[PDB]
Symmetry: C2
Subunit: 589 residues, 2 copies
Amino acid sequence: HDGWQTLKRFLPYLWPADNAVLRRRVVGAILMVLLGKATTLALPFAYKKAVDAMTLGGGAQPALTVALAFVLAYALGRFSGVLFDNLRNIVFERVGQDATRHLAENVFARLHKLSLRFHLARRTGEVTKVIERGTKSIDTMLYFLLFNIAPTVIELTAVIVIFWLNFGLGLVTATILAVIAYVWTTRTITEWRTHLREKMNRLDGQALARAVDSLLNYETVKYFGAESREEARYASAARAYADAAVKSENSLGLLNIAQALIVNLLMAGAMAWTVYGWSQGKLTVGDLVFVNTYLTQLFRPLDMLGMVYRTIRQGLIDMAEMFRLIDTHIEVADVPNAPALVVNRPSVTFDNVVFGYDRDREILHGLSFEVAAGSRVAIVGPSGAGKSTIARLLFRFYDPWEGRILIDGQDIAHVTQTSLRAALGIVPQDSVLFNDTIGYNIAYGRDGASRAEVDAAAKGAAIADFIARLPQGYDTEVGERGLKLSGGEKQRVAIARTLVKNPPILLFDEATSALDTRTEQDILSTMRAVASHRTTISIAHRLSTIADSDTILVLDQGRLAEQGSHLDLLRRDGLYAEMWARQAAESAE
Amino acid sequence: HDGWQTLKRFLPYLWPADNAVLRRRVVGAILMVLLGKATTLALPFAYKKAVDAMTLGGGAQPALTVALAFVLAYALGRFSGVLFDNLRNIVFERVGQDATRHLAENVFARLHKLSLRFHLARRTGEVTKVIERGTKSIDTMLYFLLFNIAPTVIELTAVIVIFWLNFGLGLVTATILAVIAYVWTTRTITEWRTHLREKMNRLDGQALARAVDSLLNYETVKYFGAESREEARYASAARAYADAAVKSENSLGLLNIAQALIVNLLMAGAMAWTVYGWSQGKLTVGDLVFVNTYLTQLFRPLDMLGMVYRTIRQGLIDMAEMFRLIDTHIEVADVPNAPALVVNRPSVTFDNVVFGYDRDREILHGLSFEVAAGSRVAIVGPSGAGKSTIARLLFRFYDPWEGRILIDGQDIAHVTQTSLRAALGIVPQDSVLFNDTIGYNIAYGRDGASRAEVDAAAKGAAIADFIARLPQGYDTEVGERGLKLSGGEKQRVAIARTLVKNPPILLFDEATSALDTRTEQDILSTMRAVASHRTTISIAHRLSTIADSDTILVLDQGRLAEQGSHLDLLRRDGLYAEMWARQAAESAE
């Protein structure tokens, strides 16, 4: 966390060396800065020459011409100064916005490329609040640091050197002492004011909370005649808040008093010195109005320094946070020169696969099997065998500790991630919808998803009647901030999403676990309809719902416990039959 | 909604005619206003006299003395101007706070004195947000209207008259044309800027929402490889937001450009005119620096006018709202010369009492009974007979349509409200707690509730063991933003509240309806313990819980349907026995 290395990391994001309009815009910005401060310091010189030409008219008879010219130059220079300041804002704001936009885009890209255990260790609300806080603080920090500190320090040093010329050292040390004591008392009294403002804010919150609670318990307040009690309570809270606000305004008043006091003492000293220097004939009358406009134009923008230090510290913190989110590497990555996963026979094999979510509790121990292509295979077990992890390890969200999963005899740990996630399909246990229209949710499965594929999936999931019954049809806004949908409808949406994706391999990760029995019995026929020519793996909780599979593999504590057809297991009369009778009695009860 | 009548109603709240420190403070405030503007307009006159005395030193040899004196007067006048402005803020802020505090206190008092159907027609959150919006908007409106508009209009008129003197009419019409065109272009371009800012705000909200939703659905986003899709989506939203922000800064830039342009054109014209007037010998050299400091001190505070109109309209709306909440009269009121309800024998009688909550559905029809003092009486019925209203009509929350309720043979519609609510006690169906400590909740029942009465109620409700088991004891913060309590505990708190109140008449308005059977069977013994020597009325839902009463009165559609003891009704074998067997079977099932 250092300003040097932090801003040096930021420096390519402002100076890209790739966009010529960007580098031209930033050099035009600093050009406008220097031009504005130059004309601002250069105008009162012309004003002094005007007053000198008007007062020494014994030698210069066309004082009309000379004074009129220098005076019009003064007015045009003032207008040009404000013109150049607003032009530097106009040229520079797009640069600032594009810098913070590229930084936000890059942290978003690195964030979405980051691995799943990052999104489980922290919360997505924390991440989005830190990035919006980052872009706001970086924008205001860049604006403040480049548009107050550099122009004020240029103006201050030029005023110091322009008083080193044309005047003695006494004016220079007087001005620099006034500047030092000014910024010192401003920083101290602003820290005191911020302390008072924090106290006033929390007292205000207490008063408002007392008010709303006393209003909300109106029935009991009537039940005990405590209206005078509650009025006195609210009055006490409001009185304390009023006294805190009065002390805050007292702090601001003392700030303005100190600032005006020190600047007027400096102005009195400088003007007395220059009128004495006129009296002993060294200095003309223009030097009075010279230092007069200099001081009143100098001491205005110096007030910001205390809040500038705070804002630049906050911007440094936020940029360090965004850069840390950049440099956080991914746990799972593709191998260098990753070949594409090629499928001709969508076969799965688990091979001695070892997994747990965390290293201190191993959940997957000894699974090794083969799922033939085109078949209907089934996974079931108790709540403690941990059947839910199989889809997440098949999608290469986590790599296994030991063992390997091969698709088509090829290591999915050794292929391209996008091809592996392309050849697969999943119905999640909890279906989720984007806050958008339903047609975009259906077309979400493929990037260039066509409308013919959209209503093809809508008839394939048997939801086309539901899209006909909607008022806006496919263009109905759904999800949050839209029309809520039922669970079976959402699962049909997920089925249509998978059919838009069209994989050879699909998975049901407890697709009916949160649904009712009617939607269940309706949806199993649909699942068999998608299960025409694909390799289908189904993990379920209610065995009757998977009673029709080709084979069932029953898992226990990370071991392939049982394997075989439903008739074979209900003839073997073991844990399968026990769970079956358990589910039968639990459904009968 | 007129400013005249609205502010004329507000005028006693600022000028109380009762607090001499308040009237002295407000007259000191306007004194400081006039003194500050007077010294601000009076200083550049002394500056002009200084420059004149320095330039005409052929006649005035002690130009040292004269110029030094007028210059030091100029600097001290500048400091005194800023001094008087901060003093007017210091003296006036307490006045503003006390005015809005008294208005807020009065609307709070009228609100709590208002009747119950007001709190059911509107929401308490709406009421508290309108009063906090009112006090904030009234404070900022009073501050803006009294501390910008009046000083700027005084300064503007004094500048106009001070240019009417010492100069021709041309300067006056030039300055007034510049002021008019200035405020005109400021109002127009500020309205345009506010339009752009609203568009930029809603676009920003859309971009942030897209970001957080794309982060939250991370699993499905990984499930379909749509990282590039979501990155392009977020980039598109951020790009549109950036363009909106650029257009907003363009609006602000054009505002500053127009303002600086018009003020510098006026300054160029005025200075050219006065240097020509010097050239033809009418005007001295001090008139240049005179008009020079006049214009740069004049045109700064004029920018606020467009937002001032908006803020004064909003303050007018909020003050009209607070005044409407004041003038809203109460539906139920005490009779003029209301005698105090006096109790020697706490007897109740209902007499042909007619009630409904609204006039289009009559709920109470023909109830007329007598509850003897010291007895244990019981009310029960179905869900549709409407038994819940009896406590609310006994507390005179609503008056009956026809008929009368007498306590001790006296009309409770004709006694003092505070004595009537003093002689009564209630356990509500839903217990509520203030966000405070538990000991204050126990002491809530009486205004001067002593600690001996507090632990007397705590042992009487059998909650003293629960107050011993608490870490902070009686001083434990409870409720919301504190330790949550269970339902039976909250009912015991309510019982202790009623015992602190100590009435001769108490009511149980479904005291066990939301409690479990164990807390119920524990709490009925406690209810019989409070039922020693008081007139007890109990309305219940589960008849076994009221199977021990002296008599039961069963209500049906606002009629006294059944009356008698439990043995008499279970021997009469009617609707009571049917409800009893219904509750027995519903408890067995």
